[PDB]
Amino acid sequence: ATQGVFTLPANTRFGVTAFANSSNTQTVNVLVNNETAATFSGQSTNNAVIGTQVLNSGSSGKVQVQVSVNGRPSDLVSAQVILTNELNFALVGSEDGTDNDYNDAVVVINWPLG
Amino acid sequence: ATQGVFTLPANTRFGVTAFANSSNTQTVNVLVNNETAATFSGQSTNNAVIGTQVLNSGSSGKVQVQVSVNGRPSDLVSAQVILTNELNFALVGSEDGTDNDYNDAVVVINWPLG
Amino acid sequence: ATQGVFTLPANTRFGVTAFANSSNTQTVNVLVNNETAATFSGQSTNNAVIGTQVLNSGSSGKVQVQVSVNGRPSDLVSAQVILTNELNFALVGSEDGTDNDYNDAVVVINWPLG
Amino acid sequence: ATQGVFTLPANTRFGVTAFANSSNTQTVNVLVNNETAATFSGQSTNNAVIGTQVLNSGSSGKVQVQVSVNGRPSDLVSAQVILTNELNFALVGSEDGTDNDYNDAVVVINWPLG
Ligand SMILES: CO[C@@H]1O[C@@H](C)[C@@H](O)[C@@H](O)[C@@H]1O
Ligand SMILES: CO[C@@H]1O[C@@H](C)[C@@H](O)[C@@H](O)[C@@H]1O
Ligand SMILES: [Ca+2]
Ligand SMILES: [Ca+2]
Ligand SMILES: [Ca+2]
Ligand SMILES: [Ca+2]
């Protein structure tokens, strides 16, 4: 199944934040309507917040998270959760290796903001 | 129902990170071994990170998040989501007023780390 | 925070299924656009499916689940989760008493169908 | 990533319920500690329940859902959600073709019971 792709409401501000837990440097790309809108990278095994940014979902609302480790795409897992019919989290984990913790880069998208 | 309480595996490292989206200063307390293990405080209307830390879940694994604003307890919402039977997110929203966006402090707990 | 209220896409078929796990008879009502559209009742301590139905979310998309025991409303917990950006579950648990598993009546809504 | 595999608490009863939304007959196998514990088959384009059972998670707590259509394993998507730190849902969708809603068979696992 496709993972790391979320339909947000259009023209809406959202937070995107990436955490690293791997001996390898992670590179996280965030695409809005198929165009790169943010890129984060770092190397930590203790959950460093390698990036965080406010983006606008634009007219399509399409947001896609990709993760790579020196050019090699990682396998993704993802889901969206909604609390009290209002508060939205889109969640991504990624695996660059052999141990299947899926925490090598962890991405959380949240909206609404403000 | 009780909200903002999660049973993690005992004696396990986890990340906790708080974001603010309110005109009011948010105070986030994170309890482990039924004592305050971390306190974050800050104000943003742009999803700023007001705190991030790595903690150990202690003998019981019970982690509780409480949010207050100028001494008033915020109403909480929460859930835990597990991806590929391995990657865990414990999520908290909170409301400090009337508009019911539940984003005034948003708290993300994730594990495993490393 | 409000629980058991979900906004579905308009004019969309969904399934709703109720389980009972209590010594007390559970009454589950499902409302669409603030109108009762399905009712199920029964007593089971073995997860009986006390009812399942296909409904249409209608022009408003508003779906509410209510649970009562002998006319007393039960307290609810709820959340919505989306897999692969397409498969939706709206989840409800309810508590009629003191023991706090919120499993006295459990309701699952799923879409899309067909 | 592996999908449809969940670690439940050991020696705990859980419910499993299966819905179909396809012209192809669906087969759902529920394994406990790598042995078939239940098998459901049926055909519906209207979300009919094709199977429901109460099972015991056994010594390991390992439960696996497998779906097949015409003897071919379907692609799965899955996640576990926990409400109020007590009420558990393990959720599976499956795809037997290309269409990508992952609703051809939908499986819901819930615990605790009783
Ligand atoms: C080389 O393996 C990568 O780094 C290790 C130290 C672990 O974080 C592992 O999960 C990750 O896939
Ligand atoms: C005064 O209200 C508080 O601050 C406003 C700027 C909004 O963030 C609102 O959600 C919050 O409850
Ligand atoms: Ca790894
Ligand atoms: Ca790792
Ligand atoms: Ca607010
Ligand atoms: Ca706010």
Author numbering:
A (entry chain C), B (entry chain D), C (entry chain A), D (entry chain B): 1 to 114
The publication says:
The lectin may play an important role in the process of virulence, recognizing specific saccharide structures and subsequently allowing the bacteria to adhere to the host cells. Briefly, the structure is tetrameric with each monomer characterized by a binding site containing two calcium ions and a saccharide.
Hence, amongst the four monomers that form the asymmetric unit, substitution of the sugar occurred in the four monomers of PA-IIL S23A/Me-α-Fuc and G24N/Me-α-Man, but only in three monomers of the S22A/Me-α-Man and S22A/Me-α-Fuc complexes and in only two monomers of G24N/Me-α-Fuc. As for the mutant G24N, the situation is slightly different. While enthalpic contribution is almost the same, the entropy term becomes less unfavourable (difference of about 3 kJ/mol), which could imply that the mutant protein shows better surface complementarity to the interacting sugar.
